[PDB]
Amino acid sequence: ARSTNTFNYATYHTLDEIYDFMDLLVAQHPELVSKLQIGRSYEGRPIYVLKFSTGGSNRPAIWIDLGIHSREWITQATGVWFAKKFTENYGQNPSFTAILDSMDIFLEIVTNPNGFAFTHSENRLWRKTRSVTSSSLCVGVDANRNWDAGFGKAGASSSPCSETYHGKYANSEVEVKSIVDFVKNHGNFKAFLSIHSYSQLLLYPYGYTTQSIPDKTELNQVAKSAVAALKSLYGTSYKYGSIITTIYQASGGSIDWSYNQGIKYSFTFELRDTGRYGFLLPASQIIPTAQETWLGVLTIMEHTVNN
Numbered sequence: 001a002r003s004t005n006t007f008n009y010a011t012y013h014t015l016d017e018i019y020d021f022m023d024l025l026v027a028q029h030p031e032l033v034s035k036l037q038i039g040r041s042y043e044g045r046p047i048y049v050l051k052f053s054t055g056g057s058n059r060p061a062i063w064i065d066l067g068i069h070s071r072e073w074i075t076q077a078t079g080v081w082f083a084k085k086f087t088e089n090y091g092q093n094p095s096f097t098a099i100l101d102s103m104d105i106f107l108e109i110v111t112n113p114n115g116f117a118f119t120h121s122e123n124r125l126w127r128k129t130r131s132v133t134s135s136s137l138c139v140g141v142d143a144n145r146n147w148d149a150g151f152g153k154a155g156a157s158s159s160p161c162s163e164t165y166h167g168k169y170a171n172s173e174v175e176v177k178s179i180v181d182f183v184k185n186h187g188n189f190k191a192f193l194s195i196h197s198y199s200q201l202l203l204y205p206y207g208y209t210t211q212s213i214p215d216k217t218e219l220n221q222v223a224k225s226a227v228a229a230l231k232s233l234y235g236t237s238y239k240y241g242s243i244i245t246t247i248y249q250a251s252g253g254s255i256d257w258s259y260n261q262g263i264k265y266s267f268t269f270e271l272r273d274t275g276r277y278g279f280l281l282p283a284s285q286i287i288p289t290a291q292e293t294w295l296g297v298l299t300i301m302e303h304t305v306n307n
């Protein structure tokens with residue numbers, strides 16, 4: 001609250017507290033991290049991305065976003081702990097230091113800020129964005145069904161009131177289009193990780209079709225390796241496989257889009273638990289969850305460095 005060493009990582013925070021932590025972290029480490037505004041949400045909130053960078057021109061980069069689905073509160077909490085963790089380990093861990101010496105990391109902690117506010121002010125289990133339009137008194141688009149990969153196909157709903165509603169057309173949600181523009185204008189991302197909760201799964205492309213990706217052998221192996229690093233800490237068991245195969249058919253998801261843009265290392269994590277608490281994970285599981293998913297995410301970045 002006036003030092004990120006004083007910040008309580010073991011509790012759930014509001015949007016203001018998280019954007020203030022971003023300002024404290026940048027002020028504490030101005031040579032390693034900066035805060036970029038890549039857009040504004042439907043209702044007018046700034047959308048912030050943190051860039052962690054050791055220098056260079058157009059370094060190969062890693063995208064990580066959290067909270068695209070606002071009720072999944074373990075993910076924005078894990079992202080605050082990640083941001084802090086990168087300024088603690090850089091210069092101490094050989095592995096992490098070697099990734100950041102050749103690559104940059106972009107971290108988006110709250111991808112859907114209006115939805116996250118709503119989960120605090122009115123409905124804890126709100127999933128969608130907050131746009132209103134037109135044709136329905138039902139608010140919101142599922143922002144993980146709004147991307148241009150299999151858009152509009154089976155695996156998303158067309159009624160506005162559905163939790164899985166895809167939107168009128170791809171990238172209709174400014175929260176999605178802001179990332180699409182930013183990743184394209186950068187033009188040198190090598191990995192794209194989108195973190196959700198729960199089911200304890202590590203998923204790779206496709207959700208919208210049963211056809212295997214051309215890179216399915218290599219990504220299945222990276223997923224085998226990341227899932228074993230994660231399990232090493234506390235015994236937490238993950239499954240892994242393509243989206244459509246390992247949880248269900250879904251069209252318009254972000255990782256299918258990034259993979260189709262040529263970002264080969266595209267993965268989504270489904271964090272703790274497997275059903276007991278669901279979206280309502282105890283605050284006493286935040287840091288255990290954050291610490292073992294760190295191990296799985298480090299294993300993916302190391303493989304992106306080496307290839």
Ligand SMILES: C[C@H](NC(=O)OCc1ccccc1)C(=O)N[C@@H](C)P(=O)(O)O[C@@H](Cc1ccccc1)C(=O)O
Pocket residue numbers: 069144163164196197198199203207243247250251253254255256268270
């Ligand atoms: C919409 C769904 N609703 C729900 O009630 O989930 C129940 C459930 C429980 C256990 C297993 C499966 C589903 C839900 O919130 N799903 C979550 C499990 P989550 O939002 O993390 O799933 C992700 C999966 C995904 C990942 C990449 C590309 C496409 C799809 C998602 O729906 O976006």
Ligand SMILES: [Zn+2]
Pocket residue numbers: 069072144196197
């Ligand atoms: Zn989700």
